Amino acid sequence: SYINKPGKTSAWRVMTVRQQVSAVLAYGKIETTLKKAKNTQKRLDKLITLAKVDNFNNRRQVKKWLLNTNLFDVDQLMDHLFSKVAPKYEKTPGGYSRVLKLGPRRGDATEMAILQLTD
Amino acid sequence: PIKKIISRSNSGIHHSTVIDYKKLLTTNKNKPEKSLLVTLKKHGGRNNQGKITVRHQGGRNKRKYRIIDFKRTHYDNIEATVKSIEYDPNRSCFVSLITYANGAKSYIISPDGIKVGDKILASEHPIDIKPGFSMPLAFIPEGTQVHNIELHPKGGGQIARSAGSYARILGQDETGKYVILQLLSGETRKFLKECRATVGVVSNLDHNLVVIGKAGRNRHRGIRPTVRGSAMNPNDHPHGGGEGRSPVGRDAPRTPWGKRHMGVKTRNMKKASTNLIIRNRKGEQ
Amino acid sequence: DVTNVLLKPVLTEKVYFNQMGETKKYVFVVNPKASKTRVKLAFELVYGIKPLKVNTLIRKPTTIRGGSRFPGLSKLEKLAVITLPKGIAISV
Amino acid sequence: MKRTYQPSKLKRAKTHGFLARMATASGRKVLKLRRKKQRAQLTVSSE
RNA sequence: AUGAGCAGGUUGAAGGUUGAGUAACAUCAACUGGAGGACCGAACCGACUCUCGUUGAAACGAUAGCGGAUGACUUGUGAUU
RNA sequence: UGAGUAACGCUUGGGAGUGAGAAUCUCCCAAACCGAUUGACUAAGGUUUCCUGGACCAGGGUCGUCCUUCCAGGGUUAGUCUGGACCUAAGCUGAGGCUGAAAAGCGUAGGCGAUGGACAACAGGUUAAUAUUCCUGUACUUACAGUUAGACUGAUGGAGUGACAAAGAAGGUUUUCCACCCCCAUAAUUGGAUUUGGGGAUAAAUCAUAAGGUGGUACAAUAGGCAAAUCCGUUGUGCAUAACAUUGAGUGAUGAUGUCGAGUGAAAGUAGCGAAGGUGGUAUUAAUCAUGCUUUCAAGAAAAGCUUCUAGGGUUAAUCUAGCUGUAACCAGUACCGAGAACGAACACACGUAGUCAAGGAGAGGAUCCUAAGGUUAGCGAGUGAACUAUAGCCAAGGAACUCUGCAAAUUAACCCCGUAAGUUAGCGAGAAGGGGUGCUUAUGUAAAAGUAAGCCGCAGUGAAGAACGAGGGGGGACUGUUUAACUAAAACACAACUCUAUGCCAAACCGUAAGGUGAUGUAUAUGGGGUGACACCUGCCCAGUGCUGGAAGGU
Ligand SMILES: [Mg+2]
Ligand SMILES: [Mg+2]
Ligand SMILES: [Mg+2]
Ligand SMILES: [Mg+2]
Ligand SMILES: [Mg+2]
Ligand SMILES: [Mg+2]
Ligand SMILES: [Mg+2]
Ligand SMILES: [Mg+2]
Ligand SMILES: [Mg+2]
């Protein structure tokens, strides 16, 4: 066959990662597919760990990932992160998030999973 | 005269020519008089039934016919004057605008030689012989180039009115009517002595040597493509068929229809005009 | 002047919206062949107010009842709105 | 591609219309036959 | 029959004015002038090649290339054989 | 049965809500394509598909609370817009008439027939759905009477105008654009900023003003313009070098104490509020003046309408002109789609369909890459990342050995500067071949810029995208073109040019039974036919046979 959708290009994967990390920091919970959740978790953890020092280099490095959401805009989301989310976790070595499996979806029988983060 | 067209368009080479249209004519800028123009509807080789009867005829430009006084009969013994020598597209010759002294305009055929401000006349009695005049053939002396002739009296100028054409007088017959005319192309007819005529050959003598150079130029002039019979299939032409450049198999060449063609006599000799003939371009009667 | 050219009035939300203004544009449905001259003369001789301006439109027929085993065709009607001077208003 | 039925209602009416068919002998004959077979859509003048 | 359309950019003809030259022509140089079934190339038209599809998206096409592109051009509307 | 197999026909992530049920519906926020378009306006078509509320048998390649589906209710508003009531082209019809066994065919006067001509309206607002139509404000037109003043009107007919090609170029005036300036919000925690972001307009019509364009102008005779003529035409005379006639984009003033306006913003960014609403340059751009001009040859619509002309009439006043008051302005269309879902394709199909508006950066540009105004989620998903297939990318050394052939694929690629052969119809060949430079900063550059010198970085500097691979010999055809829609685009067909033949005008050839018509409103320097096929040089021999033309006594 010939004409075909662009599909899951690497840019699509990375941009989905960015959108989901923005969404999880903004609200604190995500209800997504499991096999996107296990892939979002890595970037989530790396950001929160990179964000405990608060120098301007860390602000630049985190600006490379976040996107604005309905709750917070990006320059509001950065402050919201570095003020309350990042320091809360400052003493935990790893393990900043959990992915728990929901029930299968009616549309596709995909394995819905919830991504969240608590102490 | 003729003038070349140096093209320098690098798609083939065509040594095209065109009549100069500048040293021959007056005010080449085209402003014909409005009173004497009627549009021509281009039938395009077609018919009132709409079928094709004359092949490869169509696609000419839009023209505007100039009403030409071939009859020269409503204005007699009355002087005129040539005003301009315009290029009327329909015929190969050059038409001239004359204005009769009462103030009445007309388009005629320009005998080769007359110029702006000349005087021309039309009558029924013996008059001078200068080019452009008109009078019955019995009065024109033998030997003068005569054009715009006509067959029946008071019938207007049918015969010998093309670019550079003429006809000579050759005395009279034995009857006392029927002045003889040596037409162009070797024939010799007997015209009635009541027929009018106009002296002087027709202008634009060099239309024979103008060379259409590109197929287009010819397409715009009204002649569409003509296809040889040997290209045809055996259907819709007698010369069709044959597996590759076969020749004209039938004993003589044939027309697109089934008629025998080459050099076969065709004139309807049971006609009134056969006894007004001395010779037929080759021999007697 | 048979006044058979005033078939019916139509009462819609649009008519009320336009009517509560100052010009007081009433509306009627008229004979499909009738014309604005006949309409305004009929209005003159049915109520008593010489009308200012008359407008006519026609609603071309369409398919009605859609798919119901016996599909049908709608009704061709000419709606004429009738305008009135500023300080006047009448009822049907 | 450009298919074989490009519609233009003036052409259709003038060609298969009722005043088209009621002007030649053959058209009168075809209207005779269609009244005989009792077509509800006698010509193309009616939708 | 009647209307519409051809982004953009080049080459710079014939002719003409001037100067030399000519016994006078012819010829040459500059300037003007702006032709051509001209040039390169989009819309537009056409359909040369591969690959794919060939119970297809499609009863003849797609991506990528491809020839013409002020002319024997292209096109709409109406009439006609 | 094949089989619950191939297919499901170009695209995402989430929050909140609804609901019994959600990937699929509503809202929000992003994200990803489009942007000479998937945007905006309409013609053609289609025929209610439009708007609101409701439903989820069937249709939707899945689902569905939802659909361009179904059900109930609703919407289309014109003196000026598209068309009739005006005009005609091709052409169609066609009284009498012509021809034809019959039907029918041809055709005159008349009549129809737009894709064209002529005809008067602009701006803004409003509703869920209409809008030059409704509303607000300001206008114009064509008729009708009645009235005031002036004037003799002057057509069913004559004349002028209407009324016209293609290409090219250069000017005028506003604009685009550039600069300045008034106004508005903005003043910033990530190191640094003393800015950053946006907007800057107002119409037809009336009055005056109009650079410039066109084309002599007055007077006198008149035999023509089916009669008539003071009009046109024709012929004389003077002024001439600008008068006169006619046309004219734009300018200013009214229109406008109005509407609109960046933004602000209550009960939805809606209602209402609503500041500036400008100066100069312009060696660039489009649009109008322009139905202008110039040139060339393939010689470039008709009629109605407008102005005029007399006839005809009118005076014991008709008719027209200018103004005032009043009256009327008819008939159909007007929604919506205008296509990767309403049209033509059997469909919610990768295809096709006339015209118009067409932003910004670099750029010659409507190319090319990214974005704006605005607009869409390509109506099956979620995974895994095996063979295998398509599509892209890449491949050391070698570089055509595979192969039917270098088919395909690859290299060059824009701009600027050098230089460019053989051959020839002396036009070309030629973008020939072959080479070099390209980025940023400073100073110089001219009026902007290209350029110039110095300096600096990188592996590389039209750093990405979009831009010719070339040389040499041969065959065919001269070339540009056309062709077998949907397997052949070629060496075939055409063509310019050549020759031969027929044809003397009621031409010959042709369609038709004939009428009629083309040829041709043509006339041998013209038209039909056969054959070859630019240009140069050549076109030898045979007239027994076939064919063609002529023959004059004979034979049948
Ligand atoms: Mg199987
Ligand atoms: Mg399988
Ligand atoms: Mg499958
Ligand atoms: Mg399409
Ligand atoms: Mg289109
Ligand atoms: Mg652009
Ligand atoms: Mg583009
Ligand atoms: Mg040949
Ligand atoms: Mg040959």
Residue numbers in the entry:
A (entry chain m): 2 to 120
B (entry chain a): 2 to 286
C (entry chain s): 2 to 93
D (entry chain 0): 1 to 47
Manuscript text:
Translation of genetic information through messenger RNAs (mRNAs) into proteins is performed by the ribosome, one of the primordial macromolecular machines in cells. The ribosome consists of a small and a large subunit (30S and 50S in prokaryotes), which form the aminoacyl (A), peptidyl (P) and exit (E) transfer RNA (tRNA) binding sites at their interface. During the elongation phase, the ribosome undergoes a fundamental cycle to add one amino acid to the nascent peptide chain, which can be subdivided into three steps: decoding, peptidyl transfer and translocation. Here, we use these technical advances to perform large-scale structure classification and spatial analysis of ribosomes, to visualize parts of the translation process in great detail inside M. pneumoniae as a prokaryotic minimal cell model.
To investigate the structural details of the translation machinery, we first obtained 3.5-Å consensus maps by averaging all ribosomes detected in cryo-electron tomograms of intact M. pneumoniae cells (Supplementary Discussion and Methods). Focused refinements on the 30S and 50S subunits improved the map quality and revealed well-resolved ribosomal RNA (rRNA) bases and ribosomal protein amino acid side chains. The high-resolution in-cell consensus maps allowed us to build de novo an atomic model for the M. pneumoniae ribosome. The structure shows high similarity to other bacterial ribosomes, but also reveals several new features. Most of these extensions are predicted to be disordered, but those of ribosomal proteins S6, L22 and L29 form secondary structures and were built in the model.
